[PDB]
Design a binder for these strands. Structure first.
Ligand SMILES: [Mg+2]
Ligand SMILES: [Mg+2]
Ligand SMILES: [Mg+2]
Ligand SMILES: [Mg+2]
Ligand SMILES: [Mg+2]
Ligand SMILES: [Mg+2]
Ligand SMILES: [Mg+2]
Ligand SMILES: [Mg+2]
Ligand SMILES: [Mg+2]
Ligand SMILES: [Mg+2]
Ligand SMILES: [Mg+2]
Ligand SMILES: [Mg+2]
Ligand SMILES: [Mg+2]
Ligand SMILES: [Mg+2]
Ligand SMILES: [Mg+2]
Ligand SMILES: [Mg+2]
Ligand SMILES: [Mg+2]
Ligand SMILES: [Mg+2]
Ligand SMILES: [Mg+2]
Ligand SMILES: [Mg+2]
Lengths: 75, 159, 175, 49
RNA sequence: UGAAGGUGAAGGCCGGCGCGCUCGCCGGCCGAGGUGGGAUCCCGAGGCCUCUCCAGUCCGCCGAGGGCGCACCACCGGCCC
RNA sequence: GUAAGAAGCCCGGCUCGCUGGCGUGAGCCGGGCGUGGAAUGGAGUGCCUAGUGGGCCACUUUUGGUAAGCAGAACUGGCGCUGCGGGAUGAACCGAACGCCGGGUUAAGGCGCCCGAUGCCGACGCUCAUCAGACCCCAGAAAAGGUGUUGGUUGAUA
RNA sequence: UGGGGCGGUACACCUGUCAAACGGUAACGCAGGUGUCCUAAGGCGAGCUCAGGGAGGACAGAAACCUCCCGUGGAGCAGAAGGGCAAAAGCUCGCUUGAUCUUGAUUUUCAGUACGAAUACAGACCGUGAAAGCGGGGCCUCACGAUCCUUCUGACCUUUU
RNA sequence: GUCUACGGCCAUACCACCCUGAACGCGCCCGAUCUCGUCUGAUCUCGGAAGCUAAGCAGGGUCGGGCCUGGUUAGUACUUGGAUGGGAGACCGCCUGGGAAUACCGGGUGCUGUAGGCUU
């Protein structure tokens, strides 16, 4: 009682019958596997970005008048 | 039935080409590999540490991590219909930047400029590639001479 | 290639220029075939054997029909050939009578299928020449070099048989 | 504006050639129909339409 | 949630007492955090047809552009053992 | 195998125990700039889930074997589940894929009679067999030979 | 299992080829190997050159030992083969014990599960080096094994109702 | 025109043998107290400056060997897709497209970045 032993005959029909779908990419990929010592600092930077907000509010407010400065100088 | 070794069928791939054995020319090391860069892979067998598998020799990928001596790469792989994404850590001397985008980059910069300058003109000029078109009705001169005349030749049992 | 009734076409051609060479040489050929779509194709067949060109690396400048100059004057033609049999490859020379060069060539392709059984894709034609009444090496054509020639029309078979199919008169085959 | 004009049109549904074809399994150098038959396409259209 | 003994799910912003030290003490305000995409909804220059001019209130719709953003998805962050 | 743009480019500013001649890098904020090679068509995502888990043939590539309608593989297409026109008949060869009817035209094959259609005033040649020949898969034959006959090449002689 | 039995193991593993130039791919198809060995044959630093060939030198001879020249690896690197290595990855000397303690991520076979083997990081304690640095076993490719049960190590560790 | 220190590309830069080398350099060269290591100041370390282009290095030469690159070999060999094409088979030809390598014959024989000297 002998038999077949290996075959890849029909298979490409099976594969394409539902398709061959590349993976679904996204922005904001995942941070699984990166260096610990680098990941650590990212936390500390985000843990303190709240500071500078007033100084940030000033600069981009003045720069908004100074961004108006284009349409001012244009007009 | 075949075996399952990690270097089965690599007599020639992980083999240095002719008259290029020896130490490594070390501009390979001094290059800069930042995140988001597009990279191709080629296993050098002169050094054995951190080299990838057969399946990734000749594939192209993209960086996600950076270590002291190596790089993390995201590579696709076709295995029985479905395709998978994979994160292989690889040392530097098995990689190289890819020129497979510099052409795109020359265009967008030239194209940004060429828009902004020559905008005051008013015309929306061509900005986007077109294929090879048909071939331009034109004349041909016989500066005097009649053409040559060809014909076949008799057979000969030269050997 | 198949065949119908053939025609002669004059095709002349050229390679494509390049920053190296500006005006390459022209090349002419004289070809026999049914129509102009096939003759362009036979042109690239020969010119590729001789020189080093192809269809993508060249252009067809002119393809046109050449007409017989004296189609009401009987003429003697001589034809040089290359074909290949089931064993090797051969050359030969043959002679014919016709009014037009086309018709003589056509008359060959039939003859070769009959004596030697060669299909048209196994034949190459080199040269054709209007030969004098002398210089004819073949006797079948020299029979007719006679100023005072004649013969009868001996045993002449009934054509038109199935007009009357059942008759009473047995026929006559003497005229 | 070629792309839009053609894709507006549905592909033409024709009838079989009145008179017959020589041999569809071969090229139009060997006595067939396939390949490019450049100007003689019009002769055929007269008989399909 | 842990083998068990046993523990047991939210923050900030501002001002007073120690040195913002990736830190402990007195008083108010909000409050289930955010990034991106997001069916619908909201505001709206100028109007589409007005037998003529200008004034021009009800009503659609446009439509520039701009906002509140449901479920759900991807990521960041936070809390409990 | 990659790439062919809004998940892009540019401007300015903030935070960092990370690294440090000074600096880099990454992350957050706020603004300015829309067609980015061809030809095609509606995409995405999640649950429950049966029958199967003995295979077979053909071109091409191919291993063992003298070979096999033999044994084992790669590529695509078919059979199995699939009728119909042709191959006289036929699992798979050639054409072509099916609701029930009318008219016209075709494919592949063919046109003496069985049997639908050449009952063309068809064209040019070859060939006579005291075993004639006759259409892929395909169902029968080689070396060597022949003043049988028709063509051709070469070299000589008149 | 080219009927079964006798024979063999194609029953878990490694190299080359067959295999049709990514990868993958069969038969009791070809040729061969494994169930080990190492206190150094592991790890750092320094210095040097291999196989052979030629010409000379008391006994000395085909071959002991000395010297010079040529020497792109034609030698060696534990074992089968394949790749790779020249002021090395080889030979010789000095010092040592990263063959240690601890989380998690990835690759290989693959269902995209486990064993085993391997890779790049992080925290500790260390060794060698003038220092850059290198090292958490053997230059790379193979050398090995679940629940249940038993035995040993560890914390002034929980329970014994 | 050219050298020194550090290098990148690693024979258009290598191998053998011949000619020339102003100035600055680079080296040869002279010794062994102390530093250091050798069976042996030969190599390695140190202290020096009488003499020298002989060598090394630099440039240059060879109807030079090799290397780099063209041509020819050749639209040849081979090859995708096709046919109720041939043939007893082995194999051959054709349509549509792509397209090599030897022999043989020519040419070339190091480019350069940073810092600093000579060439008054
Ligand atoms: Mg089975
Ligand atoms: Mg191979
Ligand atoms: Mg009709
Ligand atoms: Mg077919
Ligand atoms: Mg199932
Ligand atoms: Mg089906
Ligand atoms: Mg039938
Ligand atoms: Mg039959
Ligand atoms: Mg027909
Ligand atoms: Mg019949
Ligand atoms: Mg049994
Ligand atoms: Mg293959
Ligand atoms: Mg060393
Ligand atoms: Mg070692
Ligand atoms: Mg460590
Ligand atoms: Mg008790
Ligand atoms: Mg001395
Ligand atoms: Mg000198
Ligand atoms: Mg000299
Ligand atoms: Mg030379």
């Amino acid at each position: 009682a002998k038999s077949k032993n290996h075959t890849t005959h029909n298979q490409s029909r099976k594969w394409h019958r539902n398709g061959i779908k590349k993976p679904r990419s996204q922005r904001y990929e995942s941070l699984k596997g990166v260096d610990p010592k680098f990941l650590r600092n990212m936390r500390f930077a985000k843990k303190h970005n709240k500071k500078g907000l007033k100084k940030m509010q000033a600069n981009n407010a003045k720069a908004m008048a100074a961004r108006a400065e284009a349409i001012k100088a244009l007009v | 039935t075949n075996t399952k070794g990690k270097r089965r069928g690599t007599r020639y791939m992980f083999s240095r080409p002719f008259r290029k054995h020896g130490v490594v020319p070390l501009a390979t090391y001094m290059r800069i590999y930042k995140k988001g860069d597009i990279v191709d892979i080629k296993g050098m067998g002169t050094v054995q540490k951190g080299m990838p598998h057969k399946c990734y020799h000749g594939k192209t990928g993209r960086v996600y991590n950076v270590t002291q001596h190596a790089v993390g790469i995201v590579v696709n792989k076709q295995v029985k219909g479905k395709i998978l994404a994979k994160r292989i850590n690889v040392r530097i001397e098995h990689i190289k930047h890819s020129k497979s985008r510099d052409s795109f980059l020359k265009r967008v910069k030239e194209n940004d400029q060429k828009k902004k300058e020559a905008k005051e003109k008013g015309t929306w000029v061509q900005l986007k590639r077109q294929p090879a078109p048909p071939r331009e009705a034109h004349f041909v001169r016989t500066n005097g001479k009649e053409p040559e005349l060809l014909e076949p030749i008799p057979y000969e049992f030269m050997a | 290639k198949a065949s119908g009734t053939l025609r002669e076409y004059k095709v002349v051609g050229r390679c494509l220029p390049t920053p190296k060479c500006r005006t390459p040489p022209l090349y002419r050929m004289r070809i026999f075939a049914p129509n102009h779509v096939v003759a362009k194709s036979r042109f690239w067949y020969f010119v590729s054997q001789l020189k080093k060109m192809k269809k993508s690396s060249g252009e067809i400048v002119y393809c046109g029909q050449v007409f017989e100059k004296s189609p009401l004057r009987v003429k003697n033609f001589g034809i040089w050939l290359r074909y290949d049999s089931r064993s090797g490859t051969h050359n030969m020379y043959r002679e014919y009578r016709d009014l037009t060069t086309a018709g003589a060539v056509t008359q060959c392709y039939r003859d070769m299928g009959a004596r030697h059984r060669a299909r048209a894709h196994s034949i190459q034609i080199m040269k054709v020449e209007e030969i004098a009444a002398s210089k004819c090496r073949r006797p079948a054509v020299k029979q007719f070099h006679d100023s005072k020639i004649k013969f009868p029309l001996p045993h002449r078979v009934l054509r038109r048989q199935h007009k009357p199919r059942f008759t009473t008169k047995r026929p006559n085959t003497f005229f | 504006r070629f792309k839009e004009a053609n894709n507006f049109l549905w592909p033409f549904k024709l009838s079989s050639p009145r008179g017959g074809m020589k041999k569809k399994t071969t090229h139009f150098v060997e006595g067939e129909d396939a390949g490019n038959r450049e100007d003689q396409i019009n002769r055929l259209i007269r008989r399909m339409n």
